Coordinates of C-alpha atoms in Angstrom, one line a residue:
Chain A
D330 CA 6.0 34.1 -21.0
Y331 CA 3.0 32.0 -21.4
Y332 CA 0.2 30.4 -19.4
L333 CA 2.1 27.1 -19.2
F334 CA 3.0 24.6 -16.6
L335 CA 6.6 24.6 -15.8
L336 CA 7.8 25.4 -19.4
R337 CA 11.5 25.7 -18.6
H338 CA 11.6 22.6 -16.4
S339 CA 9.3 20.1 -18.3
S340 CA 8.9 19.2 -21.9
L341 CA 6.8 21.4 -24.3
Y342 CA 4.4 18.5 -24.8
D343 CA 3.7 18.1 -21.1
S344 CA 3.6 22.0 -20.9
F345 CA 0.8 22.2 -23.3
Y346 CA -0.9 18.9 -21.9
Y347 CA -1.2 20.0 -18.2
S348 CA -1.9 23.8 -18.8
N349 CA -5.4 24.6 -17.3
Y350 CA -6.2 27.1 -20.0
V351 CA -5.3 24.9 -22.9
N352 CA -7.2 22.0 -21.2
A353 CA -10.3 24.3 -20.9
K354 CA -10.1 25.5 -24.5
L355 CA -9.5 22.2 -26.1
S356 CA -11.2 19.5 -24.0
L357 CA -8.2 17.3 -23.4
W358 CA -10.1 14.9 -21.1
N359 CA -11.5 13.0 -24.2
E360 CA -9.7 11.7 -27.3
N361 CA -10.8 14.7 -29.6
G362 CA -8.6 17.0 -27.5
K363 CA -5.6 14.8 -28.1
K364 CA -6.3 14.7 -31.8
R365 CA -6.6 18.5 -31.9
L366 CA -3.3 18.8 -29.9
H367 CA -1.5 16.6 -32.4
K368 CA -2.9 18.6 -35.3
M369 CA -1.7 21.7 -33.6
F370 CA 1.8 20.3 -33.1
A371 CA 1.9 18.9 -36.8
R372 CA 0.9 22.4 -38.2
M373 CA 3.4 24.2 -36.1
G374 CA 6.0 21.8 -37.4
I375 CA 7.8 20.6 -34.2
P376 CA 8.2 16.9 -34.4
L377 CA 6.4 14.8 -31.8
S378 CA 9.8 13.2 -30.7
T379 CA 11.4 16.6 -30.6
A380 CA 8.6 18.2 -28.4
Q381 CA 9.1 15.4 -25.9
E382 CA 12.5 16.3 -24.7
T383 CA 13.9 18.5 -21.9
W384 CA 14.0 22.3 -22.5
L385 CA 17.7 22.2 -22.0
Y386 CA 18.4 19.8 -24.8
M387 CA 15.6 21.1 -26.9
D388 CA 16.7 22.4 -30.3
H389 CA 18.3 25.8 -30.2
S390 CA 16.8 27.1 -33.5
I391 CA 13.3 26.1 -32.5
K392 CA 13.8 27.6 -29.0
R393 CA 14.7 30.8 -30.8
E394 CA 11.9 30.9 -33.3
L395 CA 9.2 29.6 -30.8
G396 CA 7.8 33.1 -30.5
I397 CA 7.2 33.5 -34.3
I398 CA 5.9 29.9 -34.5
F399 CA 3.3 30.6 -31.7
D400 CA 2.4 33.9 -33.2
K401 CA 1.6 32.4 -36.6
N402 CA -0.1 29.2 -35.3
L403 CA -2.2 30.0 -32.3
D404 CA -4.8 32.3 -34.0
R405 CA -6.7 29.3 -35.7
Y406 CA -7.1 27.4 -32.4
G407 CA -7.9 30.7 -30.6
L408 CA -5.2 30.5 -27.9
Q409 CA -3.8 33.9 -28.6
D410 CA -4.5 34.8 -25.0
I411 CA -1.7 32.5 -23.7
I412 CA 1.1 35.0 -24.6
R413 CA 1.8 37.5 -21.9
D414 CA 4.8 39.3 -20.2
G415 CA 6.5 38.0 -17.1
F416 CA 9.6 38.4 -14.9
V417 CA 12.7 36.2 -15.2
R418 CA 15.6 36.0 -12.7
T419 CA 19.0 34.7 -13.5
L420 CA 21.9 34.4 -11.1
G421 CA 25.3 33.5 -12.7
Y422 CA 25.4 30.1 -14.3
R423 CA 22.6 28.5 -12.2
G424 CA 19.8 29.0 -14.9
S425 CA 16.6 30.9 -15.4
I426 CA 13.5 30.8 -13.3
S427 CA 10.2 32.6 -13.8
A428 CA 7.8 34.0 -11.2
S429 CA 5.0 31.7 -12.2
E430 CA 7.2 28.6 -11.9
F431 CA 8.7 29.8 -8.6
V432 CA 5.3 30.3 -7.1
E433 CA 4.0 27.0 -8.3
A434 CA 7.0 25.3 -6.8
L435 CA 6.4 27.3 -3.4
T436 CA 2.7 26.3 -3.5
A437 CA 3.4 22.6 -4.0
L438 CA 6.2 22.6 -1.3
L439 CA 3.5 24.0 1.1
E440 CA 1.1 21.2 0.0
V441 CA 3.4 18.3 0.3
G442 CA 6.6 17.9 2.3
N443 CA 8.4 16.1 5.1
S469 CA -10.2 13.0 15.9
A470 CA -9.1 16.2 17.6
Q471 CA -5.6 14.7 18.2
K472 CA -5.3 13.9 14.6
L473 CA -6.5 17.3 13.5
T474 CA -3.9 18.9 15.8
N475 CA -1.3 16.6 14.2
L476 CA -2.4 17.7 10.7
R477 CA -2.3 21.3 11.6
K478 CA 1.3 21.0 13.1
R479 CA 2.3 19.2 10.0
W480 CA 1.0 22.1 8.0
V481 CA 3.0 24.7 10.1
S482 CA 6.1 22.6 9.6
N483 CA 5.6 22.6 5.8
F484 CA 5.2 26.4 6.1
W485 CA 8.5 26.7 7.9
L486 CA 10.2 24.5 5.4
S487 CA 8.8 26.5 2.5
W488 CA 10.0 29.7 4.3
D489 CA 13.4 28.2 4.5
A490 CA 13.3 27.4 0.8
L491 CA 13.2 31.2 0.0
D492 CA 16.9 32.0 0.3
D493 CA 19.4 31.7 -2.6
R494 CA 21.7 29.3 -0.8
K495 CA 19.3 26.3 -1.2
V496 CA 18.3 24.7 -4.5
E497 CA 17.7 21.1 -3.5
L498 CA 14.6 22.5 -1.6
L499 CA 13.4 24.0 -4.8
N500 CA 14.0 21.2 -7.3
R501 CA 12.1 18.9 -5.0
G502 CA 9.3 21.4 -4.9
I503 CA 9.2 21.5 -8.7
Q504 CA 9.0 17.8 -9.1
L505 CA 6.3 17.6 -6.4
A506 CA 4.3 20.3 -8.3
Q507 CA 4.5 18.1 -11.4
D508 CA 3.3 15.1 -9.4
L509 CA 0.4 17.1 -7.8
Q510 CA -0.7 18.4 -11.1
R511 CA -0.7 14.9 -12.6
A512 CA -2.8 13.7 -9.7
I513 CA -5.3 16.7 -10.0
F514 CA -5.7 16.0 -13.7
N515 CA -6.2 12.2 -13.1
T516 CA -9.0 13.0 -10.6
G517 CA -10.6 15.8 -12.7
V518 CA -10.9 13.6 -15.8
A519 CA -12.7 10.9 -13.7
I520 CA -15.0 13.5 -12.2
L521 CA -15.8 14.7 -15.8
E522 CA -16.4 11.2 -17.0
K523 CA -18.7 10.3 -14.1
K524 CA -20.7 13.5 -14.5
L525 CA -20.9 13.9 -10.8
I526 CA -21.7 17.7 -11.2
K527 CA -25.4 17.8 -10.3
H528 CA -27.0 21.0 -11.7
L529 CA -29.5 22.2 -9.1
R530 CA -31.7 25.4 -9.5
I531 CA -29.3 27.8 -7.6
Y532 CA -25.8 26.2 -7.3
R533 CA -23.9 23.4 -8.8
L534 CA -22.9 20.5 -6.5
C535 CA -20.4 17.6 -6.6
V536 CA -19.3 15.2 -3.9
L537 CA -16.1 12.9 -4.1
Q538 CA -17.7 10.0 -2.3
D539 CA -15.1 7.4 -3.3
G540 CA -12.1 7.1 -5.5
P541 CA -8.3 6.8 -5.5
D542 CA -5.7 8.9 -3.6
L543 CA -8.5 10.8 -1.8
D544 CA -6.3 11.3 1.2
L545 CA -4.3 14.1 -0.6
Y546 CA -7.4 16.4 -0.6
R547 CA -7.4 16.9 3.2
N548 CA -5.5 20.1 2.3
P549 CA -7.7 23.2 1.8
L550 CA -5.2 24.6 -0.7
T551 CA -5.2 21.4 -2.8
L552 CA -8.9 21.4 -2.7
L553 CA -8.9 25.0 -4.0
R554 CA -6.5 24.0 -6.8
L555 CA -8.9 21.3 -7.8
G556 CA -11.9 23.7 -7.6
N557 CA -10.0 26.3 -9.6
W558 CA -9.4 23.8 -12.4
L559 CA -13.0 22.6 -12.3
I560 CA -14.5 26.1 -12.3
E561 CA -12.2 27.1 -15.3
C562 CA -13.4 23.9 -17.2
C563 CA -17.1 24.8 -16.4
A564 CA -16.6 28.5 -17.4
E565 CA -15.1 27.5 -20.8
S566 CA -18.4 26.1 -22.0
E567 CA -21.4 27.3 -23.9
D568 CA -23.5 27.4 -20.7
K569 CA -24.9 30.9 -19.9
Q570 CA -25.4 30.4 -16.2
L571 CA -23.1 31.8 -13.4
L572 CA -23.7 29.7 -10.4
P573 CA -21.6 29.1 -7.3
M574 CA -20.0 25.6 -7.0
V575 CA -19.9 23.5 -3.8
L576 CA -17.1 20.9 -3.5
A577 CA -16.7 18.3 -0.8
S578 CA -14.4 15.4 0.0
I579 CA -14.0 12.5 2.6
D580 CA -11.5 11.7 5.3
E581 CA -12.5 8.2 6.4
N582 CA -10.3 8.4 9.5
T583 CA -12.4 11.2 11.0
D584 CA -15.6 10.5 9.2
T585 CA -16.1 14.2 8.2
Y586 CA -16.7 16.0 5.0
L587 CA -14.6 19.0 4.1
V588 CA -16.8 21.4 2.2
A589 CA -15.5 24.4 0.3
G590 CA -17.5 27.1 -1.5
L591 CA -16.3 28.4 -4.9
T592 CA -17.0 31.6 -6.7
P593 CA -17.8 31.6 -10.4
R594 CA -15.2 33.2 -12.8
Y595 CA -15.5 34.9 -16.1
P596 CA -13.5 33.8 -19.1
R597 CA -10.0 35.3 -19.0
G598 CA -10.3 36.7 -22.5
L599 CA -13.0 39.4 -21.6
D600 CA -13.1 43.2 -21.6
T601 CA -13.2 45.5 -18.7
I602 CA -16.6 46.9 -19.2
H603 CA -18.2 43.7 -17.7
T604 CA -15.9 44.0 -14.7
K605 CA -17.9 46.6 -12.7
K606 CA -17.4 44.5 -9.6
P607 CA -15.8 41.2 -8.9
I608 CA -18.0 38.3 -8.1
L609 CA -18.6 38.1 -4.2
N610 CA -18.8 35.1 -2.0
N611 CA -21.8 34.5 0.2
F612 CA -20.9 31.1 1.4
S613 CA -19.5 32.3 4.6
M614 CA -22.6 34.2 5.4
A615 CA -24.9 31.3 4.5
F616 CA -22.8 28.9 6.7
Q617 CA -22.8 31.2 9.7
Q618 CA -26.5 31.8 9.4
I619 CA -27.3 28.1 9.1
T620 CA -25.1 27.2 12.0
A621 CA -26.4 30.0 14.3
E622 CA -30.0 28.9 13.5
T623 CA -29.6 25.1 13.6
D624 CA -27.5 22.9 15.9
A625 CA -25.4 21.3 13.3
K626 CA -22.1 19.5 14.2
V627 CA -19.6 21.7 12.2
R628 CA -16.2 23.3 13.0
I629 CA -15.7 26.7 11.4
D630 CA -12.3 27.7 12.5
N631 CA -10.2 28.1 9.3
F632 CA -9.1 31.6 8.3
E633 CA -10.8 31.1 5.0
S634 CA -14.5 31.8 6.1
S635 CA -15.9 29.8 3.1
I636 CA -14.2 26.4 4.2
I637 CA -15.9 24.3 6.8
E638 CA -15.8 20.8 8.2
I639 CA -19.1 19.0 8.4
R640 CA -20.3 15.6 9.5
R641 CA -21.0 12.8 7.1
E642 CA -24.5 12.2 8.6
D643 CA -25.1 16.0 8.9
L644 CA -24.1 17.0 5.3
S645 CA -27.5 16.4 3.6
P646 CA -30.0 18.1 6.0
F647 CA -27.6 21.0 6.1
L648 CA -27.7 20.9 2.2
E649 CA -31.3 21.2 1.9
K650 CA -31.3 24.0 4.5
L651 CA -28.8 25.8 2.3
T652 CA -31.1 25.2 -0.6
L653 CA -34.1 26.8 1.2
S654 CA -32.2 29.6 2.7
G655 CA -31.8 33.0 1.0
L656 CA -28.3 33.0 -0.5
Chain B
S518 CA 22.6 -20.2 -3.6
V519 CA 19.8 -22.2 -5.2
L520 CA 16.0 -21.4 -4.6
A521 CA 13.8 -24.0 -6.3
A522 CA 10.0 -24.3 -6.7
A523 CA 8.3 -27.6 -7.3
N524 CA 5.0 -29.3 -7.2
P525 CA 4.2 -32.7 -5.7
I526 CA 2.7 -35.5 -7.8
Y527 CA -1.0 -35.5 -8.3
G528 CA -1.1 -31.7 -8.0
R529 CA -2.4 -31.2 -4.5
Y530 CA -0.4 -32.9 -1.7
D531 CA -3.3 -35.5 -1.1
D532 CA -2.4 -35.9 2.7
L533 CA -4.5 -39.1 2.8
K534 CA -1.9 -40.7 0.5
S535 CA 1.4 -41.7 2.0
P536 CA 4.2 -39.2 2.1
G537 CA 6.6 -41.6 0.4
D538 CA 4.9 -41.5 -3.0
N539 CA 3.9 -37.8 -3.1
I540 CA 7.5 -36.6 -3.8
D541 CA 9.7 -38.2 -6.7
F542 CA 13.1 -36.6 -5.6
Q543 CA 15.7 -39.0 -4.6
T544 CA 17.4 -39.0 -1.2
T545 CA 20.6 -37.6 -2.6
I546 CA 19.2 -34.4 -4.0
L547 CA 17.0 -33.6 -1.0
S548 CA 20.0 -33.8 1.3
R549 CA 21.7 -30.9 -0.3
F550 CA 18.6 -28.7 0.3
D551 CA 18.2 -27.7 3.9
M552 CA 14.9 -25.7 4.0
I553 CA 12.1 -27.8 2.6
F554 CA 8.7 -25.9 2.9
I555 CA 5.4 -27.7 2.1
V556 CA 2.8 -24.9 1.5
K557 CA -0.7 -26.5 1.7
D558 CA -4.0 -24.9 0.9
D559 CA -6.7 -24.7 3.7
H560 CA -10.2 -23.6 4.0
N561 CA -11.7 -21.8 7.0
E562 CA -13.3 -18.7 5.4
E563 CA -11.7 -16.3 7.8
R564 CA -8.2 -16.5 6.1
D565 CA -10.1 -16.7 2.8
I566 CA -12.0 -13.5 3.7
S567 CA -8.7 -11.9 4.7
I568 CA -6.9 -13.0 1.4
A569 CA -9.9 -11.8 -0.8
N570 CA -9.9 -8.4 0.8
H571 CA -6.1 -8.2 0.5
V572 CA -6.1 -9.0 -3.2
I573 CA -9.3 -6.8 -3.8
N574 CA -7.4 -3.8 -2.1
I575 CA -4.1 -4.6 -3.8
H576 CA -5.8 -4.1 -7.2
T577 CA -4.0 -1.0 -8.4
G578 CA -6.8 1.5 -7.6
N579 CA -5.9 1.6 -3.9
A580 CA -2.5 -0.1 -3.2
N581 CA -0.7 2.8 -5.0
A582 CA -1.6 4.9 -2.0
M583 CA -1.2 2.6 1.0
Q584 CA 2.3 1.3 0.2
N585 CA 3.5 4.9 -0.1
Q586 CA 2.5 5.4 3.6
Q587 CA 4.8 2.4 4.4
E588 CA 7.7 4.5 3.2
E589 CA 6.5 7.6 5.0
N590 CA 6.0 6.0 8.5
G591 CA 9.3 4.2 8.2
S592 CA 7.7 0.6 8.4
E593 CA 9.6 -0.6 5.3
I594 CA 12.5 0.3 3.2
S595 CA 12.8 0.5 -0.6
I596 CA 14.5 -2.3 -2.7
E597 CA 17.6 -0.5 -3.7
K598 CA 18.5 0.5 -0.2
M599 CA 18.1 -3.2 0.7
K600 CA 20.4 -4.1 -2.1
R601 CA 23.0 -1.7 -0.9
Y602 CA 22.6 -3.0 2.7
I603 CA 22.9 -6.7 1.7
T604 CA 26.1 -6.1 -0.3
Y605 CA 27.6 -4.0 2.5
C606 CA 26.8 -6.7 5.1
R607 CA 28.2 -9.4 2.8
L608 CA 31.4 -7.5 2.4
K609 CA 31.9 -6.5 6.0
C610 CA 30.7 -9.1 8.6
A611 CA 31.5 -12.7 9.1
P612 CA 30.4 -14.0 12.4
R613 CA 31.5 -16.9 14.6
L614 CA 30.1 -19.3 17.2
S615 CA 30.5 -19.7 21.0
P616 CA 30.9 -22.8 23.1
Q617 CA 27.4 -22.5 24.6
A618 CA 25.9 -22.2 21.2
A619 CA 27.9 -25.3 20.1
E620 CA 26.6 -27.3 23.0
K621 CA 23.0 -26.3 22.2
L622 CA 23.5 -27.3 18.5
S623 CA 25.0 -30.7 19.5
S624 CA 22.1 -31.4 21.9
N625 CA 19.4 -30.4 19.3
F626 CA 21.0 -32.5 16.7
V627 CA 21.2 -35.5 18.9
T628 CA 17.5 -34.9 19.8
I629 CA 16.3 -34.7 16.2
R630 CA 18.3 -37.8 15.2
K631 CA 16.7 -39.8 18.0
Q632 CA 13.2 -38.6 17.1
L633 CA 13.8 -39.6 13.4
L634 CA 15.0 -43.0 14.6
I635 CA 11.8 -43.4 16.6
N636 CA 9.6 -42.4 13.6
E637 CA 11.5 -44.7 11.4
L638 CA 11.1 -47.7 13.9
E639 CA 7.3 -47.1 14.2
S640 CA 6.8 -46.6 10.4
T641 CA 9.0 -49.5 9.3
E642 CA 10.1 -47.8 6.1
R643 CA 13.0 -45.5 5.2
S644 CA 12.1 -41.7 5.6
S645 CA 11.5 -39.9 2.4
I646 CA 13.3 -36.8 3.9
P647 CA 16.8 -37.7 5.6
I648 CA 18.6 -36.1 8.4
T649 CA 22.4 -36.1 8.2
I650 CA 25.4 -34.0 9.2
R651 CA 24.5 -31.7 6.3
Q652 CA 21.6 -30.6 8.4
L653 CA 23.8 -29.7 11.3
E654 CA 26.0 -27.7 9.1
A655 CA 22.8 -26.0 7.7
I656 CA 21.7 -25.1 11.1
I657 CA 25.1 -23.6 11.9
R658 CA 24.9 -21.6 8.7
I659 CA 21.4 -20.3 9.6
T660 CA 22.7 -19.1 13.0
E661 CA 25.7 -17.4 11.3
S662 CA 23.4 -15.8 8.6
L663 CA 21.0 -14.5 11.4
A664 CA 24.0 -13.1 13.4
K665 CA 25.2 -11.5 10.0
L666 CA 22.1 -9.3 10.0
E667 CA 23.2 -7.0 12.8
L668 CA 26.9 -7.1 12.0
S669 CA 27.6 -8.8 15.2
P670 CA 31.1 -10.3 15.3
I671 CA 29.9 -13.2 17.5
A672 CA 26.7 -15.3 17.3
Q673 CA 24.9 -15.9 20.5
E674 CA 21.7 -17.7 21.9
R675 CA 19.4 -15.1 20.7
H676 CA 20.1 -15.9 17.0
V677 CA 20.5 -19.7 17.7
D678 CA 17.0 -19.9 19.3
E679 CA 15.4 -18.4 16.2
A680 CA 17.4 -20.6 13.9
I681 CA 16.3 -23.6 15.8
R682 CA 12.6 -22.5 15.5
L683 CA 13.0 -22.0 11.8
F684 CA 14.5 -25.5 11.5
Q685 CA 11.8 -26.9 13.7
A686 CA 9.1 -25.4 11.5
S687 CA 10.8 -26.7 8.3
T688 CA 11.2 -30.2 9.8
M689 CA 7.9 -30.8 11.4
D690 CA 6.1 -29.4 8.3
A691 CA 7.7 -31.9 5.9
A692 CA 9.7 -34.7 7.4
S693 CA 7.9 -35.5 10.6
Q694 CA 4.4 -34.7 9.4
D695 CA 2.0 -37.8 9.8
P696 CA 4.8 -40.4 10.0
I697 CA 2.3 -43.0 10.6
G698 CA 0.7 -42.5 7.1
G699 CA -2.8 -43.0 8.4
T706 CA -1.8 -55.7 15.8
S707 CA -3.5 -53.8 12.9
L708 CA -6.9 -52.2 13.6
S709 CA -8.5 -55.2 15.4
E710 CA -7.4 -53.8 18.7
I711 CA -8.5 -50.3 17.5
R712 CA -12.1 -51.4 17.5
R713 CA -11.5 -53.4 20.8
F714 CA -10.3 -50.3 22.6
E715 CA -13.0 -48.0 21.4
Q716 CA -15.7 -50.4 22.7
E717 CA -14.2 -50.3 26.2
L718 CA -14.2 -46.6 26.6
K719 CA -17.8 -46.3 25.6
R720 CA -18.7 -49.2 27.9
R721 CA -16.8 -48.0 31.0
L722 CA -16.6 -44.3 30.6
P723 CA -19.9 -42.5 30.1
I724 CA -20.4 -39.0 28.7
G725 CA -19.5 -36.2 31.0
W726 CA -17.3 -38.2 33.4
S727 CA -13.5 -38.6 33.4
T728 CA -10.7 -40.9 34.4
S729 CA -7.0 -40.4 35.2
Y730 CA -4.5 -41.2 32.4
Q731 CA -2.3 -43.3 34.8
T732 CA -5.1 -45.6 35.7
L733 CA -6.3 -46.3 32.2
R734 CA -2.6 -46.8 31.1
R735 CA -2.1 -49.2 34.1
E736 CA -5.2 -51.3 33.4
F737 CA -4.5 -51.6 29.6
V738 CA -0.8 -52.5 30.1
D739 CA -2.1 -55.1 32.6
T740 CA -4.2 -56.5 29.8
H741 CA -2.9 -57.2 26.3
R742 CA -3.1 -53.6 25.2
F743 CA 0.3 -52.5 26.5
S744 CA 1.4 -48.9 26.7
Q745 CA 2.4 -48.3 22.9
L746 CA -0.9 -49.1 21.5
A747 CA -2.9 -46.8 24.0
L748 CA -1.2 -43.5 23.4
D749 CA -1.5 -43.6 19.6
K750 CA -5.2 -44.0 19.5
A751 CA -5.6 -41.8 22.5
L752 CA -4.3 -38.9 20.6
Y753 CA -6.2 -40.1 17.6
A754 CA -9.6 -40.1 19.4
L755 CA -8.5 -36.6 20.7
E756 CA -7.7 -35.6 17.1
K757 CA -11.2 -36.9 16.2
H758 CA -12.5 -34.5 19.0
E759 CA -16.0 -35.8 18.6
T760 CA -16.4 -36.8 22.3
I761 CA -12.9 -36.8 23.9
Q762 CA -11.3 -33.8 25.3
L763 CA -8.0 -33.0 27.2
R764 CA -7.9 -30.5 30.0
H765 CA -5.8 -29.9 33.1
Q766 CA -2.4 -30.9 31.7
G767 CA -2.3 -34.6 30.5
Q768 CA -4.2 -35.9 33.4
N769 CA -7.9 -35.3 32.9
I770 CA -9.4 -37.4 30.0
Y771 CA -12.8 -35.6 29.6
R772 CA -15.4 -37.3 27.4
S773 CA -17.3 -34.6 25.5

C-alpha cells in the first residue's frame, strides 16, 4: 500500500493530489507543483482521462502493473518512500478496505456527523458523534462507513483549501523561538472548533514546514476564532523530522513543553483561560487576553 | 400557468405621472392576470444598509457556509424535496369550499366592487386595472391553492383570510394606488388660509366641528376630507392622534 488518500475509493489523480507527503515533496499549492504532477503522469504513461476515473472501472492491466510502473518511475521525483506494506480486509463480495482508509473514515465520522451552555452543547454533540462512530464499527452497517468516507473527502478538500490560502498569505510569523500563525478571518472557520480537525490542519502544516530547506526545529502555535464565544482556541504543535530519516537521529522523540508553559503562565498570572481538555497542550483563551499572554510565553523559559 | 415580468414606460414608475399612461397593456390582457405586483424602489438607507450587507455576505466567500446551517437546523428544505412534495400534493389533494367561506367571498367582492366604483366616480376616467368576475374566480383559486398546501380536503376561514390579505396587497399596490393622480385648487388655497388663521400651532379642534362649519359654508364634506388627509400626508404641521377626533397642529 501507499501513503495515498483513499486510493481504493477515489481516482488516482485525486489520490496523488490530496496526499500530504506528495504535497510536501512537490509543492502543489502553486502552479509548478501541478506542472510536475502532469510531467509525472505523462512519464508514467497513464492518460490524464484514464487517471481521473473510479478505481473500480480503472483499467485492469494498469491496475495490475501499477506496482512496476511506480517502482520504475518514482525514483526520479524522489517519492520512493511512499511504498509500504499494509493490511487489507475482504469479506465475501463486498469489496476491499485498508486499515489506513478505515481509520481515516472513522476519524472523519468523529469530526462531522448528525457561552457555557453552547460549550456544553458542543461537548454533547461530540459525545454523540463518538457513539455514532462506535456504532459504525460492526460489520452489519456500511451506510455508516460510505458516509464517513465521503465526509473524509470533503474535510480533506476543506483543509487543503484553507492551507493553500495560509501559505499564500504567509501568515506564519517567524519569531526567535517558536513560529506563530493566527487564522483571524477567512471562510468556513466554524469547522475548526474541533480540536481533532485543528490537529489535522496542524499536521499538514508541520509536514509542509518540515519538507523545506530550513534547518530550524521550532514548535508551532496555531489559533482559531469562534465568533459566537469570542474565544481563541490555541493548540501547541511539536516539530517532526522528515519521514525518510534513519534511526540514529531518533535517540528520543521530540517532547512537548506547551502544557508546562501554559500551566506555569496561568498559575503565575490571572489570565482568563479554560484548561480542561484531556490534551494538555490545547487551551481556550480570550480574544483580548491572547496577546499579553503571548508575550509572556515569549519571555518565559520554555 | 404564466409568470410574466415587465417594465413600465419611462423606466421607473414615475409616480408623479398619472397611472393611466405608465402601463401600455390593454384592459383585456390585464384581466386574465390576477396577481399584479408593482415593485418600486425606495431610499431610507436602513433597508439600503441591510441589502448591501446581504449582498456583501452572499458573495461566495461566506454564504457557502451559512446556507448549509439552514439545512442542518431544519429551517429550509432542498429544491428536489420541494419538487417531490409539490408533485405529490398536485396528484393527491383537491380541496373544496364551505358556505361560510362563500359568504365571506361574496361580501368581499361586493365591497371591492363598490370601492372601485367610488374611485372611478372621483377620478372621472376608466380604471387602468379592472375588477371583474375573473377576480372573484381568482380569489377562489387562491383559497383552494392555500388549502392544498396542507392536504386539507376542505378549505376554511384560516386560508380565506390569508388569500384575502394577498389580494388586498396586490390590489391596493397597483389598482387603488393614488387614484386621484395628484372646484379645482382655488378652494385648496382658500381652506389652507382658514386653518392657519383660525387654528394656531399647538392647539387642536374636533373633526366634527370643522366638518360642521365647512359643510355650513360652501366647502361641503367631500372637499374637506381629501385635503385633510393631504395636509396630514404633508405632515409639516398637521398630526392625527386619539383616533379620528384630535386634529393636532404640529
